[PDB]
């Protein structure tokens with residue numbers, strides 16, 4: 530499960546936060562990235578939560594950004610990787 | 617940081633939950649256990665939370681138990697291990 | 704946002720959990736309900752997280768259910784913001 | 795429970811965070827405040843987590859502070875349960 534969204538609704542030229550929420554199961558060699566116009570963003574902060582009861586994990590990758598008319602943002606998940614754009 | 621407590625206040629003979637909350641920093645090869653009269657309890661459930669922003673982790677180890685007059689419970693943390701009794 | 708989903712993938716006849724995740728700003732007059740064929744379910748528990756700094760809130764409304772082909776499940780959210788309460792169907 | 799602690803170990807003169815963690819049952823008339831020398835701090839934000847299933851609640855009240863030897867910091871909790879409001883000092 531992958532959900533991509535901005536902390537606040539977007540005004541171009543106003544600093545904001547982009548978020549990728551990811552959920553899954555078991556032990557797993559999964560990796561996550563935020564993209565700007567198709568290239569990986571570096572120093573992306575995350576939040577990792579896991580529960581032994583059901584081998585479940587919950588990940589939120591987030592970054593400061595200033596949304597612009599030009600720029601295209603996405604979130605990508607590999608180990609094949611699945612890309613979810615923001616809108 | 618280690619905090620040991622029962623979900624509900626204890627009536628002997630009533631099923632309850634014992635909890636060990638542990639907090640720390642950085643990457644780390646730390647391990648955690650709940651003890652009954654000094655021996656490790658098996659199949660103990662946990663909750664692991666970590667944040668990249670400050671290399672911080674937060675762990676809650678919990679188990680069903682029926683508190684008794686006889687039995688002594690603790691939480692132990694190694695990698696030396698530090699033992700915190702419940703009361 | 705509002706997201707409706709089953710804990711595990713859905714097999715008709717098999718016990719599962721239905722979840723309504725709702726996130727926003729100014730909890731305020733926020734009400735959330737899970738419906739089965741338009742009627743409120745009484746098994747419904749929830750998990751409320753809120754932060755004072757920015758009046759941000761995160762809600763999970765959940766219940767045990769046994770999904771069937773005939774049955775329709777939905778989540779209902781009403782807020783000062785919305786002209787009319789919002790219904791989000793599942794699958 | 796009530797636990798008062800600094801985010802990082804305390805160096806006099808150095809910016810830090812003070813935290814008051816409060817957990818219980820029936821949030822109800824729960825009020826929580828951080829004091830500096832007996833006076834409420836206005837920088838105070840909080841993080842509220844609650845579950846309907848068992849009326850269980852987990853609160854973190856926090857603020858930026860610069861600890862000094864002279865200054866006394868505390869957390870104050872009042873509840874229907876308590877005869878009188880409880881003050882827990884830090885360190």
Ligand SMILES: *SCCNC(=O)c1cnc2n(c1=O)CCS2
Nearest residue numbers: 536546575576577589591592667
């Ligand atoms: S992940 C555990 C609680 N923290 C957050 O959710 C969190 C913390 N800091 C920041 N964001 C968060 O979502 C993103 C914008 S700043």
Ligand SMILES: *SCCNC(=O)c1cnc2n(c1=O)CCS2
Nearest residue numbers: 580623633662663664676678679
């Ligand atoms: S750790 C994330 C949220 N879950 C809990 O805190 C949790 C879940 N289930 C059970 N307990 C919890 O504390 C212990 C008794 S049952």
Ligand SMILES: *SCCNC(=O)c1cnc2n(c1=O)CCS2
Nearest residue numbers: 532550706724750751752762763
């Ligand atoms: S009540 C806190 C546990 N749930 C979540 O944090 C949660 C669950 N589902 C989804 N998100 C969450 O943050 C991300 C978007 S959908």
Ligand SMILES: *SCCNC(=O)c1cnc2n(c1=O)CCS2
Nearest residue numbers: 619637797815841842843853854
């Ligand atoms: S607002 C949720 C983040 N804080 C905690 O979950 C938390 C913080 N500090 C301590 N405990 C927590 O659960 C365990 C006992 S002290």
